[PDB]
Structure formats: C-alpha cells, structure tokens
C-alpha cells in the first residue's frame, strides 16, 4: 500500500537559473512551504501509525 | 547523478535556450525544428544573441 | 509596491552607498509645500531635477552607476507626472519628455502624462517610483530628457529578518 | 524608446520579443511604421512532453 508513488505529473513553475517576478515567486514559495509542511506532517503521522499497528 | 532517459526522446540544449528555439540564434541552429519527450535546459544557455529579452 | 514591501520585510535593514551623479547647469534642490522637513522640502533620499529657471529648456543627460559590492543593489528612481501641461512647461519647458532605464536584465520606457487629477495633500501633480534589483556587478544607466527624480544614494540589503503588521 | 544603456555583447541597442498564442482560426495583423522585427516562420506545438533544468 505505501511503497507505490503517484502518477500525477508536475511541471516546472520556477526558473532556478533566472528568477521569476518576486510577487508570484513569493506566492509560489509560500504555497510550496505549506504543501511540504502538510506532507511532512502526513509522513510523520503515517510512519507512527504503521509502526504502532505493526507492534500491536 | 545523471539524467536517466531510455525510450523517451531527449534534446540537450547546450548553449541554447528554450526561447532561442523560436527566434534562432547561431547557438540554436540545430534545434529549430526539434522534437522530444524530454527537454533539458542548461545554465550556460543564452536566449538571445543581440542584447535583449522576452516579455512574459 | 508589494514585491518591494516583501523585499524590505526580509531586508534586515538597508545600507546606503553614495551614488555620485553630478549635475551641471540645472537646479537639483526641489521644493514642495506638502513634503515639509522644515518650511518647504523634498524627499531626503531623492533629488528633484528642475530647469535652471522657469519655462527653460532641460538638457538631455545620461547618468550611469556601477555596482561594486558582492550583494545585490536596490535602485529606486521616480517619474513626475505634472498636474497640468502648463505646469510642465513651467517646470521642465516645452517638448516631449522621455526617460529610458537600462540594465543587463531590465529595460523600460517612461513618458510623463500631464493632466488634472484630484487634490491630495494640496498638490495636483503626482509621482510614480519604480525599482529594480541590480545584480552584484550590473551597470544601470539613466538616460532621461526630464521629469526624472534621481536617487541620491543606493540601497543594499543587510541580512535576514521578518516583517509584521499590527496596531499594538 | 531610443536611449543610452549599458554595454552588453558590444551593442548598446536592445530588442524586445513579444508573443501571442493565435487561435486555430484567427487572423493576426502587423501594422508597423518601423522598429519591427518580423517573424520569418510561425511556430506550432507538436505534442506533450516535460521540461527539466539540470547541469549533469
Ligand atoms: C523562493 O525560494 C527559493 C529556494 O527554494 C529561492 O531560491 C534561492 O535564491 C537565493 C537568492 O535569494 C539563491 O542564492 C539560491 O541559490 C536559490 N535556491 C534555489 C534552490 O534556487 C528564491 O529566491 C525564493 N524566491 C523569493 C522571491 O524569495
Ligand atoms: C563592477 O564592479 C567593478 C569593481 O571594480 C566596477 O569597476 C564596475 O564598473 C562594476 N560594473 C560593471 C562593469 O558591471
Ligand atoms: C482563417 O484562415 C483564413 C485563411 O487561412 C483567413 O482568411 C480567415 O480570415 C481566418 N479566419 C479567422 C476567423 O481569423
């Protein structure tokens, strides 16, 4: 169940070599930090759940 | 540490940019009518030969 | 304005380096009643460029600044829109005015628009401020024919920080 | 806008490229008095793909 990754295809939205406008760049950075905070919390919660469920 | 691409067409734009494929500098002569399923941009790629930029 | 506000929120402070910019013939003091340090004054960090006398020709000048430090530079200039075309002929003289700003990755054209507006702070004329973030070694060029508010000093970021808005 | 700028690549003059995405049947008109860089050929998209940026 867990090992399978996604099939959604993600594009580049930021040019690392040349900077994007600074307003939409800050919006993109804030959205990416919020998304990775959500995914980090989900990862920690999922690891704790499956470890506890394996022991039980 | 190297881009894996097996069975997908690959264009490596050394010294060329994506926006240069439309306008055609001397550095982008090979990729005027390019076709790929995976396009790679480099840091050394320059879009223009005469000084200038692309709006949007 | 919002991108510059975000930059100044994580600025950590601003460091000022003297942009030399010597002017010949024309006045460079500027005077308005709305903006008062004491009596009549203008912005401390910007210089108003007028003709030597009223209804006189404004010579075309090109001024260039070179960046020498290892950090990006913040360059802020201004474009003055007169409250009337008669006021623009009084301040800068007759003829069309054009300001061209040049850089390695920045280029933009400004034309002042004389016209009547509403009265805010007792002045009908209005002023835009435009900004660029110069690269650790990029040369900015200010070729202007008039209606230009030149920066006295550049701005350099200091560190990191945060910016909050509150009323307590 | 004729005006003096900094020297990049030995040229003081500069050029701006603007783009539009014409519709499967739309007529574009270029009425110019000068300072125009006309396109020799149009550009048409081929399919789908992905674009990456790397230095390897
Ligand atoms: C958004 O975040 C990225 C990092 O995720 C920032 O990119 C860095 O920018 C600094 C200069 O400010 C460079 O020294 C780094 O090398 C960049 N890192 C990467 C991975 O590109 C970007 O500047 C941020 N955007 C804004 C508007 O703050
Ligand atoms: C870059 O910095 C050097 C420092 O010596 C300075 O002379 C030069 O004019 C600056 N401007 C350029 C060329 O971008
Ligand atoms: C469609 O293309 C034709 C010729 O290629 C042209 O004459 C016609 O005006 C175009 N139609 C529209 C709606 O632009």
Find the closest chain D residue to B48 by CA distance.
D15
Tell me the sheet residues that pair with C141.
C64, C102
Q: Where are the beta strands (DSSP E) in D1-56?
A: 15-17, 50-53
Contact indicator for A13, A32 with CB cutoff of 8 Å:
no
CA angle C51, C106, C71 (to 5 degrees): 100
Q: Is D45 part of the contact surface with chain C (CB cutoff 8 Å)? A: no
Pocket of ligand 2 (CB under 6 A): C 66-68, 137-139
Query: CB count, 10 Å around CB of C90?
Result: 15
Instruction: Count Cβ atoms below 10 Å from residue C151 Cβ, excluding itself.
Output: 23
Cross-chain residue pair D6–C143, CB shorter than 8 Å: no
Give alpha helix (H) positions in C40-138: 85-91
CA distances from D29 to B54, C14, D32 (A): 20, 48, 9
Cβ-Cβ contacts under 8 Å for C31 (sequence gap 6 or more): C40, C41, C42, C48
- DSSP codes, A3-55: S----------S-SSS---HHHHHHHHHHHHHHHHHHHHHHHHHHHHHHHHHH
Q: How was this structure determined?
A: cryo-EM
């Amino acid at each position: 169940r867990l090992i399978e990754k996604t099939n959604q295809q993600f594009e580049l939205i930021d040019n690392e070599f040349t900077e994007v406008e600074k307003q939409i760049g800050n919006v993109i950075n804030w959205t990416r930090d919020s998304i990775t905070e959500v995914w980090s919390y989900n990862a920690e919660l999922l690891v704790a759940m499956e470890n506890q469920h394996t022991i039980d | 540490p190297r881009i894996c691409s097996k069975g997908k067409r690959t264009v490596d734009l050394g010294q060329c940019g994506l926006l240069g494929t439309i306008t055609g500098p001397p550095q982008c002569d090979q990729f005027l009518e390019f076709s790929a399923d995976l396009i790679i941009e480099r840091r050394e790629g320059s879009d223009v030969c005469y000084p200038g930029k692309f709006v949007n | 304005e919002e991108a510059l506000r975000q930059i100044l929120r994580e600025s950590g402070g601003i460091d000022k380096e003297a942009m030399g910019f010597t002017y010949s013939g024309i006045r460079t003091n500027g005077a308005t009643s709305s903006c008062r340090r004491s009596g009549s004054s203008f912005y401390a960090e910007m210089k108003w460029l007028l003709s030597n006398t009223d209804n006189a020709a404004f010579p075309q000048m090109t001024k260039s600044y070179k960046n020498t430090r290892k950090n990006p530079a913040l360059i802020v200039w201004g474009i003055h829109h007169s409250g009337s075309t008669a006021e623009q002929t009084k301040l800068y003289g007759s003829g069309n005015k054009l300001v061209t700003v040049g850089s390695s990755n920045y280029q933009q054209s400004f034309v002042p628009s004389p016209g009547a507006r509403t009265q805010v702070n007792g002045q009908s004329g209005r002023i835009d401020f435009h900004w660029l973030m110069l690269n650790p070694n990029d040369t900015v060029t200010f070729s202007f024919n008039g209606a230009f508010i030149a920066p006295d000093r550049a701005s350099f970021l200091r560190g990191k920080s945060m910016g909050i808005q509150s009323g307590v």
